[PDB]
Amino acid sequence: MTKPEILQLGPYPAWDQEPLDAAFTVHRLFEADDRAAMLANVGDRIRAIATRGELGASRALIEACPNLELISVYGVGYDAVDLAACRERGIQVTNTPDVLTGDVADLGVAMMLAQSRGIIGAETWARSGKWAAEGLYPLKRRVFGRRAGVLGLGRIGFEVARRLAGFDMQISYSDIAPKSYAPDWTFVEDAVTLARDVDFLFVTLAASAATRHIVGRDVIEALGPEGMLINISRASNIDEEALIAALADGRLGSAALDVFEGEPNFDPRFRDLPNVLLQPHHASGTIETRKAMGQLLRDNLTAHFAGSPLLTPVVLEH
Numbered sequence: 414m415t416k417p418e419i420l421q422l423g424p425y426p427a428w429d430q431e432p433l434d435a436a437f438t439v440h441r442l443f444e445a446d447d448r449a450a451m452l453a454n455v456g457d458r459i460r461a462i463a464t465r466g467e468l469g470a471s472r473a474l475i476e477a478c479p480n481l482e483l484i485s486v487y488g489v490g491y492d493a494v495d496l497a498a499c500r501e502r503g504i505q506v507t508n509t510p511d512v513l514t515g516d517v518a519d520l521g522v523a524m525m526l527a528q529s530r531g532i533i534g535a536e537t538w539a540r541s542g543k544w545a546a547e548g549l550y551p552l553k554r555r556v557f558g559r560r561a562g563v564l565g566l567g568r569i570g571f572e573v574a575r576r577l578a579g580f581d582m583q584i585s586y587s588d589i590a591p592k593s594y595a596p597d598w599t600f601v602e603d604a605v606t607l608a609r610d611v612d613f614l615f616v617t618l619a620a621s622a623a624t625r626h627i628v629g630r631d632v633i634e635a636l637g638p639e640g641m642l643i644n645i646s647r648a649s650n651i652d653e654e655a656l657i658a659a660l661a662d663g664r665l666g667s668a669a670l671d672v673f674e675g676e677p678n679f680d681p682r683f684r685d686l687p688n689v690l691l692q693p694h695h696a697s698g699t700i701e702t703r704k705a706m707g708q709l710l711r712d713n714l715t716a717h718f719a720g721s722p723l724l725t726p727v728v729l730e731h
Contacts, residue, residue: 416436416437416438417436417437417438417460417461417718418437418438418439418440418455418458418459418460419433419437419438419439419440419459419460419461419462419463419714420439420440420442420455420459420461420462420463420478421433421439421440421441421442421443421462421463421464422442422443422462422463422464422465422468422470423443423464423465423467423468424443425463425487425707425710426703426707428704428707429487429707429708429710429711432711433463433711433714436711436714436715437714438458439463440455440459452474452477452478456477456478456479457478457479457480458480459478459480459481460480460481460482460483460718461481461482461483461484461485461714461717461718462474462478462481462483462484462485463485463487463710463714464484464485464486464487464494465486465487465488466486466487466488466489466490466491466492466493466508467488467493468493469486469491469492469493469494469495470484470493470494470495471495471498472495472497472498475495475498475499475502475504476498481502481504482504482505482717483504483505483506483507483713483714483717483723484499484504484505484506484507485506485507485710485713485714485717486506486507486508486509486710486727487509487706487707487710488508488509488706489508489509489510489513489619490508491506491508491727494506496728499728500728500731501731503730503731504728504730505717505723505726505728505729505730506726506727506728507710507713507723507724507725507726507727508725508727509705509706509709509710509725510568510725511568511725512702512705512706512709513696513697513702513705513706514568514569514572515572515702516696516697516698516699516701516702517569517572517645517696517697518569518572518573518575518576518645519576520645520671520692520695520696520698521569521573521615521617521643521645521671521696522573522576522577524643524645524669524671524690524692525556525561525613525615525641525643525669526556527669527690528641528643528667528668528669528690529553529554529555529556529613529641529667530553530554530556531550531551531553533690534550535550535553538550554639556580556582556613557580557581557582558580558581558582558583559582559583559612559613560582560583560584560585560610560611560612560613561577561582561583561584561585561611561612561613561614561615562584562585562586562587562601562607562608562610562611562613562614562615563577563584563585563586563587563598563614563615563617564586564587564604564607564614564615564616564617564618564626564628565586565587565588565616565617565618565619565622565626565646566586566587566588566592566595566598566617567588567617567619568619569617569619569645569646570586570588570615570617571592571594571595573615573617574586574595574598578597582613584597584598584599585598585599585600585601585607585610585611586598586599586600586601586607587600587601587602587603587604587606587607587625587626588600588626589623589626602625603625603626604622604625604626604627604628604632605625605631605632605635606635607632608632608633608635608636608637608640609635609636609637611636611640612639612640612641613640613641613643614632614636614640614641614642614643615643615644615645616628616642616643616644616645616646616650616651617645617646618646618647618650619646621647621649621650622650626650627650627652628642628650628651628652628656629652629655630652630655630659633652633655633656633659633664633665634659634664634665636665636666637664637665637666638663638664638665638666639666640665640666640667641666641667641668641669642656642665642667642668642669642670643668643669643670644668644669644670644671644672645671645672645696646672647672648672648673648674648676649674653673653674653680656668657680657682657683657686660686660688660689661686666688667688667689667690668686668688668689668690669689669690669692670683670689670690670691670692671692671693671694671695671696672694672696673694676693676694677693677694679691709724709725712724713725
């Protein structure tokens with residue numbers, strides 16, 4: 414009988430770990446006192462690596478696993494997997510796409526609403542007792558019927574737009590080209606123009622932006638003193654120095670951010686600003702989404718060793 418041997422690079426939740434350990438002989442590199450010793454011992458045996466978007470899989474690690482067949486990634490991104498090393502060797506790669514899309518879009522829209530309607534401060538207002546002792550919470554700003562732009566209209570951006578339509582917003586978007594699935598929303602070529610004409614701008618860029626889609630000083634300034642920036646996609650696509658200065662100056666009205674450079678050790682200055690909603694990178698943070706991601710990782714591994722097609726490959730066998 415066989416329990417295929419796999420190398421796991423970082424921890425997973427128990428609901429994935431248990432069935433992984435039941436089906437496979439799992440070597441936990443992240444629990445090893447000595448990396449080289451474990452690789453010497455089991456490297457030859459490793460037929461698959463189970464990793465995470467963050468951790469990836471280096472060339473040296475791949476070289477230490479000469480009989481490697483598959484690297485399965487928990488998460489959407491797989492930047493840190495050495496693809497050239499994989500393609501040289503006929504190693505296939507899978508990820509876990511699609512299962513997080515709706516929850517990410519939900520949090521983005523929720524964040525816009527929370528910042529615009531001052532929900533954080535309003536909770537504190539009632540909880541602290543200032544509602545009774547002082548009076549009314551200050552009037553906040555309407556969302557419905559106003560103008561929203563979506564920067565990047567892929568899976569996530571599309572789902573955001575669908576949610577915004579239920580609020581009767583005037584929706585525009587920018588991307589590399591118009592999308593066939595956006596017949597009722599206005600395509601805009603560049604991020605500056607997009608920002609100029611909207612009250613709320615969602616950054617939902619799945620990859621490293623092209624120049625005209627990067628969120629720098631010009632885009633931020635065009636978004637304007639009563640505009641709001643909502644970011645639920647990678648930190649690298651926003652100039653944080655430009656963002657902080659604009660928020661401080663009043664050149665940008667407000668921001669709601671779920672992702673930050675160097676997170677969780679995000680720039681302390683974001684804490685000092687009165688117009689910033691902070692979230693701890695949990696746009697995909699639901700029980701259902703995380704279970705689905707883990708299930709997909711496991712289903713790819715199961716399919717591979719069974720001789721069945723991979724569910725969600727990102728690299729073919731070359």
